[PDB]
Design a protein around this ligand. Structure first.
Ligand SMILES: [Zn+2]
Ligand SMILES: [Zn+2]
Ligand SMILES: [Zn+2]
Ligand SMILES: [Zn+2]
Ligand SMILES: [Zn+2]
Ligand SMILES: [Zn+2]
Lengths: 697, 697
């Protein structure tokens, strides 16, 4: 059911947990470094979990796909064939940027955070600056012990702050991946869809140095020995059974004001989807003649195509359930209730009014803010603005520098400059500059920027065509040139007659103002947001409900049951798929082309001891009413006793609105059953050593 | 489950009945004139049932559609608006050809039948003639009492013969029909499909004369008073509940030899579907310019389009389940078993061999037999051959005349001659003569008919074009001319220089030979068929199974349970549809255009006391594993206590092979729930008087 619950509040929702089917105490699962939550690790963008005392880590195949790809060549194509390391020495590096973060300590720092906010008071902008400041110092201090990465997270509008210190494992090796036609069966056709038949799993192993401290890749490293790890279920999972997921959902906005929501649904999402569709059109079209354009923009267009399709999906989902109506009605009920109280209710009504003010402020300049951001996200101008900005930031003490522009950020920046080249064609990027300058000249005139008009030398298509011509003389199309500028101080920027650099110098005063306008609204949100949210929580209590905080990249538990859904009268989606269903989709050309050993095993009914009696086959994937979102890929699904019964890997189409709502009747997670993991590793692409290692061989 | 059981064998299948859920004794439902089977009536082509002591009869809306249409004008359009008779005087005639047949007496005449076959022995053709003879006399005698129609039916290859004497009610009036957008919701789009949301019901009332004997329509008639009638369930029907249907399925061929089946599936069905598709192509094409062609051929093309689509459906269903394989395997097992016996098994092996002989005989001339039949089914030549044939038959005593060509048949013949005109255009029919003559010249030469080649004056396209030209001089395109010939004796036929008539005179000796070849194979089938079938029954017993006879237009009981099916992994069709599902399909243009009072009632949740708690709405249609086929439309669905819970009206797509197999996992009947009948009659198109009459008002 609905909710991304923090571990610390589990004892408080004991009754609902118990009622859903949980058999462990809330106390035991409320311990983030205990059994089993201390087994759950973050990979940065994906969830994963320890599954052996010798550092074996399980996650999705699409989470590991970069690692797998990195180790693949046409000659030895792991993507297609799968990968299996018979001994730990056979295991291959996932790359320098691969991580496993294991929780080591949590601290509640709410009082210190709130003081640094308070003690620098009344002034919104300075409130935002004092919180930044507090944060940068806390992390610096916490990260003084080498081998740790620390993060500070704010809950429910900054009602609570917690510091997480994580062991940062930096040598991650690939141990196993099924063939791609298992790990990605159905491809893009079956994405977001049920029925699903995708074996979306893979295994890493975590390594440390002989001294037990994190270390970069080295053949002197040895497997990390986790304190906790998960074990495979010994009871079969069936329809109605309790399940729970632990993972790191990135963000939700479940408590947004009705007007905030209307703004996104009526302006933000349609606007961004239109832009993205337009840029896609132009890449494909340019792309059919070049061929260099269509290879270098390929990932770019895929990213825009996802978001475009995602937003369009959400917008349809909103209509389906009248999202904006329900939000309006609930909100009226909360305001009604607050008026209900006396003087007591006034603070929350104020906070609400203020939030509505802040919303109008940001709406006044929304076309401009968006257009400018995306224009500055084109290759030569992004490059120019980022580097000039770095040059300004470099002149303050590292501690006073803007996050993203610090010592620690420098390798990431330098890397993007190089990476840039793989996705940049001058002819293409000029069409994209054109596109965005034309969006800028079409803005409502009250959101023009005098600075930008000044640099353009006007505000119509003729000024734009001139500026494009002027800009084609930049040298920043060259990686050398960009690293040159990477090194340059700001007087060099302000003396440059390179037209990309002159743009950056001309717009930066404006970019900085807008930044400080954002931080000012944030400083205000800091005061009003927790107060409004506290009142939502109070009103929920009065209806006997519990509340959970919006997701914020911290570990959460969602719980519920295995169950299907019915999108139409006379029909139901059943909670499980089976082996025979994989085979019935076989074409086999991509993406419905299973390995021959799979086709044969299912044809022989070689179920390998894993058959579930209730469905009469080995289950493949399943549906349940858990509440997950981006960041939960790879998350372990556990049963009523804390044992591993699957991995989260996708949602059904009706999950696409997870940022905004949860629909008890239709929102479902799609998991791959742990029995399918085992079956694949027994009968199709065998990993006897790993099964032996996990006590199921 | 599988089986169309005759009432007399129900006590013998007591255990399976009891186990499925039946709560009445087998004894009670085995009585064809008792409670409730004596309520079930035949309409000629459709099933129906008495539902009141005052003669009210319920059936499907598509069964009553002719009656409804007959009473409709553009001004007063019952098809669209529905019809409701507030008093019995408001009830309107269903037409002179409408019937309700009520069972009055059954007799087992097996011994007399078998004697007349035996006593005229050894000779196959004469066996066929003696059975014809026996039959014509039995019926004549039985029908001596005015007001009765009698029928003789042969069971399991003529192992048993029963005589049914039925009261023939001839004044049938329409009492109620819902609007067409209920009675035919979904139209042709939802035909053969689930999910289904069609209120396919209508009500007649049966009338007799003031003396209680059948009579043709007259305002002096009064309602017939049936001895038994059905009552509406007082328990809600749910998933898994026992259901049974009683009705008059026309024909099945469940025990066909594997080779008989291969012949149909590999030759008959594909051949006929091809022909029908070709003739359709030519009607549409000619039809777009005429407009008179496309109106007069409209029903013709619909008939060909059904059969074509039906056959294509069956052929796909056969592949889906490997029908030909299963038949082969079962058959091998039966032959195996028979060899298993000693001398005892030899008669059945002989019978089988003989059946296989008879099959080869008919296969030797199958292209010819088919081509000639369909050529003689064109308007001018059918007309010519039927009338010449009548002229020959007229010269023997009525008793010795061929069935179809007797005194009793004469009005039917005269009517077709007139009706002909509504579906005949000379230009069109000439293209159809052309089509068929070209099929004839393309035959394998070993199936040519010297007679036909003789009349053509050759056997190629030039002879065909000449014959078409010759034939366009017929006068039989005129209804007058045809009635003229209706009256004519055979010397007049044999002296005619009308080219249609000259064809008839030239081919008749051949048509008569082929007829006698058919009756000869039949006479043989009479001896070998029951013996093979008896051995199938014996082999079934040895596996502990019961056997049912192929359908033959007599009353049968099928039983089973309410249940869905799952055509694909991860998905199921649920056994019920609901009101909200009707509304969710609303477009409303035809055929998804429900009455506004339906849309409003569902929107208000005016469930009228009929809501089933398990589904949370009023059920609309449901699925079950009963075994029905053509003739079962309108059949009452009864529950475990013999109460009315619905009417059969269609099958799911996987039912399309009902003539040949039954698939326990996929074959389903679609019924309209009796609660939906009541709901429509309470909330949408009200019939309070009828609900009061049936004790649910
Ligand atoms: Zn237990
Ligand atoms: Zn442990
Ligand atoms: Zn099994
Ligand atoms: Zn009872
Ligand atoms: Zn009765
Ligand atoms: Zn209700």
């Amino acid at each position: 059911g609905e909710g991304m619950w923090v571990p610390q509040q589990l004892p408080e929702i004991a009754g609902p947990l118990k009622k859903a089917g949980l058999k462990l105490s809330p106390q035991q699962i409320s311990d983030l470094t205990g059994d089993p939550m201390g087994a759950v690790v973050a990979l940065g963008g994906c969830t994963a979990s320890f599954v052996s005392p010798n550092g074996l880590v399980v996650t999705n195949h699409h989470c590991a796909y970069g690692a797998i790809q990195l180790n693949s060549t046409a000659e030895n194509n792991l993507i297609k064939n799968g990968f299996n390391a018979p001994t730990t020495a056979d295991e291959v590096s996932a790359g320098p940027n691969a991580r496993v973060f294991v929780l080591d300590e949590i601290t509640d720092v709410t009082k210190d955070a709130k003081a640094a906010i308070a003690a620098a008071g009344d002034d919104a902008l300075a409130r935002t600056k004092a919180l930044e400041a507090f944060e940068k110092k806390l992390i610096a201090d916490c990260e003084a012990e080498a081998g740790f990465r620390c993060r500070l997270y704010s809950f429910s509008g900054g009602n609570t702050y917690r510091l997480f210190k994580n062991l940062e494992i930096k040598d991650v090796r690939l141990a196993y991946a099924p063939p791609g036609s298992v790990g990605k069966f159905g491809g893009d056709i079956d994405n977001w869809m049920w029925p699903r038949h995708t074996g979306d799993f893979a295994f890493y192993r975590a390594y440390v140095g002989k001294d037990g401290k994190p270390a970069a890749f080295s053949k002197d490293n040895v497997p990390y020995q986790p304190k906790h790890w998960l074990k495979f279920a010994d009871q079969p999972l069936g329809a109605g059974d309790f399940v729970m997921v632990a993972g790191y959902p990135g963000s939700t906005n479940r408590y947004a004001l009705a007007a905030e929501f209307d703004n996104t649904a009526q302006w933000t999402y349609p606007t961004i989807a239109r832009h993205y569709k337009n840029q896609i059109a132009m890449v494909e079209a340019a792309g059919k003649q070049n061929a260099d354009i269509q290879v270098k923009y390929a990932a770019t267009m895929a990213g825009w195509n996802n978001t475009s399709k995602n937003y369009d999906g959400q917008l349809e989902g909103f209509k389906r359930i009248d999202a904006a109506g329900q939000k309006l009605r609930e909100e009226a009920a909360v305001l009604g209730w607050l008026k209900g109280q006396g003087a007591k209710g006034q603070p929350a009504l104020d906070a609400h009014a203020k939030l509505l003010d802040l919303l109008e402020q940001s709406k006044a300049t929304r076309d401009r803010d968006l257009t400018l951001a995306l224009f500055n996200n084109t290759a030569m101008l992004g490059s120019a603005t980022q580097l000039y900005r770095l040059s300004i930031e470099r002149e303050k003490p590292n501690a006073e520098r803007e996050s993203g522009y610090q010592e620690r950020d420098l390798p990431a920046i330098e890397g993007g400059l190089k990476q840039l080249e793989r996705r940049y064609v001058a002819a293409m990027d000029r069409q994209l500059q054109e596109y965005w300058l034309n969006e800028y000249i079409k803005l409502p005139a009250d959101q023009r920027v005098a600075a930008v008009d000044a640099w353009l030398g006007g505000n119509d298509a003729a000024a734009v065509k001139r500026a494009l011509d002027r800009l084609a003389g930049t040298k920043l199309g060259s990686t050398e040139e960009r690293l040159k500028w990477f090194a340059a101080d700001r007087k060099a920027f302000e003396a440059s007659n390179d037209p990309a650099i002159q743009y950056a110098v001309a717009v930066m005063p404006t970019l900085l103002k807008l930044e400080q306008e954002r931080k000012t609204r944030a400083g205000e949100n800091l005061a009003a947001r927790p107060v409004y949210l506290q009142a939502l929580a109070d009103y929920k209590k009065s209806q006997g409900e519990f509340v959970y905080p919006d997701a914020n990249l911290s570990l959460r538990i969602t719980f519920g049951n295995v169950m299907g859904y019915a999108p139409k009268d006379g029909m139901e989606y059943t909670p499980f798929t089976t082996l025979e269903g994989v085979v019935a989709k076989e074409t086999g050309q991509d993406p419905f082309d299973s390995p021959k050993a799979l086709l044969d095993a299912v044809a022989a009914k070689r179920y390998g001891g894993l058959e579930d009696k209730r469905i009469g086959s080995v289950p493949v994937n399943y549906l349940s009413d858990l509440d997950i979102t981006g960041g939960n890929a790879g998350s372990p699904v556990l049963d009523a006793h804390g044992k591993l019964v699957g991995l989260a890997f996708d949602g059904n189409w009706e999950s696409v609105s997870s940022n905004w709502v949860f629909d008890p009747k239709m929102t479902r997670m799609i998991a791959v059953d742990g029995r399918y993991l085992r079956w694949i590793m027994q009968e199709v692409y065998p990993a006897p050593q790993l099964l032996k290692e996990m006590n199921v061989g």
